[PDB]
Amino acid sequence: SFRDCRGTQLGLGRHTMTPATIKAVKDTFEDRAYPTIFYMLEAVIHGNER
């Protein structure tokens, strides 16, 4: 509770996420039927710009 109150003190006037992005990211992190094609493509692409 102290850590959350301190975080409320830090994020007083700073940038916050609009609830649409919060809902979409929370939906995609709790999606158990996430396809493995994204995982394989991220594994093969492996963060190369080319």
Place this chain on the structure above:
Amino acid sequence: NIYRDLLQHVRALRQTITDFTIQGEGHNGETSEALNNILTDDTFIAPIL
């Protein structure tokens, strides 16, 4: 979305059962959740199989 919400609520109930027990205390092959709760007790079975 409705089916995933129902499944997520079931898993939230399971995590709530897990939260309100203390782990590491297992007597005679019964885990702590099975010794505290019933929905985690393996001896109790579903109404239909």
